[PDB]
């Protein structure tokens, strides 16, 4: 599980990256859960984040 903060982040970043939140937390976890870094992360390679992740937003 995650902390309440990582939780909020998972949801927030799901919203920021619009990745199905599993890919979001995948990203968000490889990105230390520092938000902006997963922002940098997905949005560094957002053409390569599969559309199952990029979803219908």
d(CA 1, CA 56): 26
Q: Would you say the C-alpha torsion 38, 41, 44, 47 has a positive or negative sign?
A: negative
The CATH number of the structural domain formed by 1-57 is 1.10.8.10
- Cβ-contact 10, 28 below 8 angstroms: yes
* Residue 22, token pair as written in the block: 């599993």
Domain segments of the chain: what residues?
Answer: 1-57
- Cβ-contact 50, 26 below 8 angstroms: no
Q: How was this structure determined?
A: NMR
């Amino acid at each position: 599980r995650l902390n309440p903060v990582q939780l909020e982040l998972l949801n927030k970043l799901h919203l920021e990256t619009k990745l199905n939140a599993e890919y979001t937390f995948m990203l968000a976890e490889q990105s230390n859960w520092n938000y902006e870094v997963a922002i940098k992360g997905f949005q560094s390679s957002m053409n390569g984040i599969p559309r199952e992740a990029f979803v219908q937003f």
